[PDB]
From a paper:
AetD adopts the heme oxygenase like fold and forms a hydrophobic cavity within a helical bundle to accommodate the indole moiety. A diiron cluster comprising two irons that serves as a catalytic center binds to the carboxyl O and the amino N of the substrate. Akak et al. conducted biochemical analyses and confirmed that Fe(II) is required for AetD activity and the nitrogen atom in the nitrile is sourced from the α-amino group of the substrate instead of exogenous nitrogen or the enzyme residue.
Nonetheless, we successfully solved the structure of AetD/1 crystal that was not soaked with Fe ion. The AetD/1 structure harbors the substrate and a metal ion that is coordinated and located as the Fe1 observed in AetD/1/Fe. Based on the fact that the purified AetD carries Fe ion and the highly identical coordination status to other HO-like proteins, this metal ion should be reliably modeled with a Fe ion. Intriguingly, the Fe2-corresponding site is vacant and the Fe2-coordination networks are dissociated owing to the disordered helix α6 that deviates H179 away from the Fe2 site. Because AetD/1 and AetD/1/Fe share the same unit cell and space group, the conformational change of helix α6 is not a result of alternative crystal packing. Instead, it is possible that Fe ion in the soaking trial could bind to the enzyme and stabilize H179 to constitute the intact diiron cluster. This metal was modeled with a Ni ion, whose presence could be competed by soaking crystals with Fe ion.
Numbering used by the authors:
A (entry chain A): -2 to 237
B (entry chain B): 0 to 177, 185 to 238
The structure:
C-alpha cells in the first residue's frame, strides 16, 4: 500500500537534500578549472574497491531461488565491474602517483577518510540479516546517492575527456547511464519496489535503512569537502 | 561451561599450529629472508585490525564492566599496525610502486580471506554482549599468538644478523600479546552463551585457517620475492 510509497518518497526527499551539499556546488562550479574540481578523486580509492567487495561478497547470493535476490545478483554483477573504471581514470587524471607501499596504505587508512573507508562496512553490517526485498531498499538508497555523486563528477570529467581526447570511464556520463539501467531484459530494482507491499515492521526497518544510507553518504561527502579545502593549490594533471 | 570453551580454544590452537604454512616458517634449512616472503600479505590485514580495535570492538559510549575492560585491551592492540609498517621497511618490502599497484595488491583475489577476516569478525561481533565479545577477542588473540610465535623465529634471526630493532615479527610483540582470559575463567555462561561461544571459536579458527592458506599459496607464487634487509 502507501508503506512502500512513503519509503520511495523518503529516498527522493533525502536525494534532494544530498544534491545541495557544498561539495556538489564546488564540483559543478564551471568558474574553477575541471582539473582543480577533481582534486578529490584519489579519496575514492578508500571506497571503490570496498564497494566491489560489498557487491561480490555481501549483496550477492548465487544459491538463492528468491525472485528478489536473483534480481539483486544480476544488478550487483554489473555494479562490481566499475572499480576498473576508477583505476582507468586514476591514471588519466595523473593521480596514479609512484609512492612507497606504506604511503598508499597510510593514505587509504587515513583518519580523514574514515567515513569513506567504512561506508561499505556499515552497509554490510546493516545488510547481514535483511530479507532480499529489504536488501533492495539498501541498494536503491545507495545507488540514488551514488548517481547524485557521479552526475556531478561527470561535469568536470567530460570537460577533461573532451579537451584531452581521452576516454574517461568512471567520472563520465557513460558510468551514470549504465548505472541508471535502461536496457531490455531484467527490471530495475525501483520497478520491483513500486510493485511491492511493505508490512508495518518492514516500513519502520526501511525508514532506518534510508536514513542511515544517506547519513553515511553525507559523512563521506564531508570528508571529500575537507580534503578539497586542504588541496585547492593542487590539481589533476591529465595529459593529452 | 567456560571450561568447555577454553578447552575448545586449546584444541583449535593445537590443530592450527600444525598447518603447513607454520612448518614452512619454522624450517631453519630455509633462509629467514625466504620464510618472510609472506610478510607483505599482512598489509591486507594489519590496518583493518587497527580499525576493528578502534571502531568495532571499542565502544566509548558504554558504562558496562566487561566493555570497559575490552576498551583498555583495544587501546593496546590498535597500536601494532605501526610495528607492521616499521618491519615492512626493515625487510625491504616498502617498495616504490604506482598507487594502483598498491590497491590491486591489497584487493587481490589471492588475499580475499586475509582482507575479509576483520570484516567477518566485525559482523560476528556487532550484536554480541561484552562477555561474548571477550570470547571473540581471546580466540582471535590465540590464533594471532600461534602466527607471531612462528614469524618471530625468522624475524629475530634477521633482527640479530642485521642489528635492527624489529617490532612486529619479534619477541617483543609476542610478549605484549601474553586480564581477560582471567575473568573468562571466573565468569558464568548460560547454555545460550555456551552454544554461541562454541560457534564464535569455530568461526574465528576457520577464518584464520583460510588466511594462513592464502599466505602459503602466496609464498609458492612468489618464491623469488625474498626479504632484502640490510645491516646497520
Ligand atoms: N557508482 C559507484 C558506486 C557508488 C554507489 N554509492 C556511492 C557512494 Br554513496 C559514494 C561513492 Br564515492 C560511490 C558510490 C562506483 O562504481 O564505484
Ligand atoms: N535503449 C533502450 C532499451 C534498449 C537499449 N538498447 C537497445 C537497443 Br541496442 C535496441 C532496442 Br530495440 C532497445 C534498446 C532505452 O533506454 O530505452
Ligand atoms: N597481533 C596481531 C593481531 C592478530 C590477531 N590475530 C591475528 C591473525 Br588470525 C592473523 C594475523 Br596476520 C594477525 C592477527 C597484530 O598486531 O597485527
Ligand atoms: Fe558505479
Ligand atoms: Fe598484535
Ligand atoms: Ni543495475
Ligand atoms: Ni537504453
Ligand atoms: Ni545486526
Ligand atoms: Ni591484546
Ligand atoms: Ni604477485
Amino acid at each position: 500500500g502507501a508503506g512502500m510509497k512513503a519509503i520511495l518518497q523518503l529516498i527522493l526527499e533525502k536525494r534532494q537534500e544530498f544534491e545541495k551539499l557544498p561539495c556538489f556546488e564546488f564540483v559543478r562550479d564551471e568558474t574553477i578549472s575541471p582539473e582543480e574540481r577533481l582534486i578529490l578523486y584519489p579519496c575514492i580509492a578508500a571506497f571503490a574497491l570496498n564497494f566491489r567487495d560489498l557487491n561480490r561478497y555481501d549483496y550477492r547470493d548465487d544459491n538463492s531461488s528468491d525472485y528478489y535476490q536473483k534480481i539483486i545478483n544480476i544488478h550487483t554483477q554489473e555494479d562490481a565491474k566499475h572499480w576498473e573504471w576508477f583505476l582507468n581514470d586514476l591514471e588519466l587524471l595523473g593521480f596514479d602517483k609512484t609512492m612507497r607501499f606504506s604511503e598508499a596504505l597510510r593514505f587509504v587508512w587515513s583518519d580523514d577518510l574514515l567515513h569513506t573507508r567504512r561506508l561499505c562496512h556499515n552497509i554490510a553490517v546493516l545488510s547481514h540479516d535483511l530479507e532480499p526485498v529489504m536488501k533492495m531498499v539498501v541498494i536503491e538508497a545507495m545507488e540514488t546517492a551514488g548517481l547524485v555523486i557521479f552526475h556531478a563528477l561527470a561535469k568536470p570529467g567530460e570537460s577533461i575527456a573532451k579537451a584531452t581526447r581521452r576516454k574517461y570511464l568512471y567520472v563520465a556520463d557513460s558510468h551514470v547511464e549504465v548505472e541508471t539501467g535502461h536496457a531490455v531484459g531484467t527490471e530495475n530494482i525501483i520497478t520491483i519496489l513500486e510493485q511491492t507491499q511493505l508490512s508495518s515492521e518492514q516500513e519502520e526497518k526501511a525508514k532506518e535503512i534510508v536514513n542511515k544510507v544517506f547519513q553515511w553518504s553525507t559523512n563521506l561527502i564531508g570528508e571529500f569537502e575537507r580534503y578539497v579545502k586542504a588541496h585547492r593549490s593542487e590539481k589533476a594533471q591529465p595529459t593529452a
